[PDB]
Amino acid sequence: EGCCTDPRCRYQCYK
Numbered sequence: 001e002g003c004c005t006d007p008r009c010r011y012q013c014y015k
Contacts, residue, residue, distance in 0.1 A: 003009030 001009075004013045
């Protein structure tokens with residue numbers, strides 16, 4: 001969801 005790249009989302013790529 002174009003979030004994995006982000007640091008905050010990177011922590012939880014699978015939500």
